[PDB]
Design a protein around this motif. Structure first.
Motif, PDB file in Angstrom:
ATOM      1  N   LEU A  87      -3.574   4.291  -1.401  1.00  0.00           N
ATOM      2  CA  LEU A  87      -4.523   4.565  -0.329  1.00  0.00           C
ATOM      3  C   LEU A  87      -4.311   5.972   0.207  1.00  0.00           C
ATOM      4  CD1 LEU A  87      -6.092   1.952  -0.249  1.00  0.00           C
ATOM      5  CD2 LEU A  87      -4.872   1.318   1.858  1.00  0.00           C
ATOM      6  N   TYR A  91       0.861  -1.181   0.000  1.00  0.00           N
ATOM      7  CA  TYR A  91       0.000   0.000   0.000  1.00  0.00           C
ATOM      8  C   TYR A  91       0.890   1.220   0.000  1.00  0.00           C
ATOM      9  CZ  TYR A  91      -3.648  -3.053   1.979  1.00  0.00           C
ATOM     10  OH  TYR A  91      -4.566  -4.066   2.199  1.00  0.00           O
ATOM     11  N   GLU A 120      -9.160   1.161   7.479  1.00  0.00           N
ATOM     12  CA  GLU A 120      -8.184   0.417   6.675  1.00  0.00           C
ATOM     13  C   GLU A 120      -7.572  -0.760   7.437  1.00  0.00           C
ATOM     14  OE1 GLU A 120      -5.542   3.481   5.238  1.00  0.00           O
ATOM     15  OE2 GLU A 120      -7.129   4.314   3.968  1.00  0.00           O
TER      16      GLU A 120
END
Lengths: 191, 191, 191
Positions: free
Chosen positions: C30, C6, C39
């Motif tokens: 993200l 991410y 998350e």
């Protein structure tokens, strides 16, 4: 790419080294301007124009292309080019060792990116510009056509440099430039 | 080249890293000046002198050589050296990572080319000179013996710098210098 | 290291390129600040914070870590790091291509070392500092937390730069700085 390459060329030997690094087997120097038209009777090996001068390089580029040759890019294996960057294909661009070109940057026809220059994300380097060794362009920098960026010079983020401009050795460009100009750094002073 | 290397040396650890990069298996530090003559009774592994100071390095170089040792060059594998460039063999030259030496340049005995320095085509770098990190010499530049080029300094094309000269940090040499001198850049100013 | 990463992110694409260079297979962006707590219900792939701003990066770093994620270092394969140097493990440090970190240097959490920067022996680079492209720190240099070193800037040997300081583009720091400050270079002048 062909096994041999013609180089129109001291810059000639340097471009030869880059061609050999890429895997070209032999280099043939073809330095003559007059009678260039006759060269069209030669085998069509890849061609490169090893001239640091932007205006001469463009003239030769146009003449060579009109004679049925492919003018390739010479890109040292150590140059790092983001997959999202655009380097114009077969456009006589020189990319020297340890040059880094980041995401979404664009390098136009006939550019020279000399050793250890850095082109950060989203830059545009205009056709037949000359970026000298160690010169660095920050993010979102637009360099016009036919510009010269001196050794160890730099351009701060989000700036544009107009066509046909010169940034001196060691100089740091700090403002947008919509008009052509000459931008100087500070020379070493004898003490 | 031997499997082990003696280093006459903080510069010592850095030279050790370069030696290990080249494939040397073990490094032996030998920092003593007095009683150096007795070292001649030791196995003749390759030797290197890891001293940034040009005058001390030359003194040790001469003393080590007289004691029957080979003073090798330490050249990081990432240094790029044109096949037409001349790097004096077994001459105690240090070439650090990402240094690039272009066609027909010449590097003399005892030189230090520190990380990311660039020596363009046809340059001559004089014996026991110190080229600091990021310093760049343009085409056809002649650097005298025992010169120091500061961090991120540069020398414009076709210029000569006389023996025993100093170019400061960040400085850009712009004129030929037939006499020794000290050439300063501009310091960062607190605002 | 996980197969996916991410990235909290134009810097995002650049960090993506570095992650892919390291061998990460997929990158997931993200960018949302609000609702970040949710998350934590996602698979715990490695995380990186691709924000050039030191204060925002630290804020996100602290928030991401509190949500049960590992914030990895992204280190380009061409970066050279001395085995005796210390790079804080899993600390959201970015090390870009052709960066060199010499013996016994220390790089703290959240630092950015941008392309072709050089950290010489025994340096300490303080947490969440930003070392721009081509910036070079000489031996035994201490850079405080949350400092910014501009493009092609440098810091001479044995100097300390206090927390929260800024060194401008092209600037050369020449004196110890025990207090926070802003240290400027010289801008290119239109001629």
């Amino acid at each position: 790419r062909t096994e041999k390459i013609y180089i129109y060329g001291g810059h000639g030997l340097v471009c030869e080294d880059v061609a050999k690094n890429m895997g070209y087997k032999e280099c043939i120097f073809l330095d003559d301007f007059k009678g260039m038209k006759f060269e069209s009777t030669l085998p069509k090996y890849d061609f490169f124009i090893a001239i640091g001068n932007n205006e001469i390089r463009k003239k030769i580029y146009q003449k060579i292309s009109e004679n049925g040759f492919k003018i390739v890019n010479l890109i040292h294996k150590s140059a790092l080019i983001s997959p999202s960057a655009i380097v114009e294909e077969n456009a006589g661009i020189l990319i020297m060792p340890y040059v880094v070109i980041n995401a979404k940057a664009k390098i136009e026809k006939g550019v020279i990116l000399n050793t250890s220059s850095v082109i950060e994300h989203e830059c545009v380097i205009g056709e037949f510009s000359h970026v000298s060794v160690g010169a660095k362009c920050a993010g979102n920098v637009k360099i016009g056509k036919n510009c010269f960026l001196g050794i160890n010079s730099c351009v701060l983020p989000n700036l544009s440099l107009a066509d046909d401009s010169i940034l001196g050795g060691g100089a740091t460009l700090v403002k947008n430039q919509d008009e052509k100009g000459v931008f100087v750094g500070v020379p070493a002073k004898r003490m």
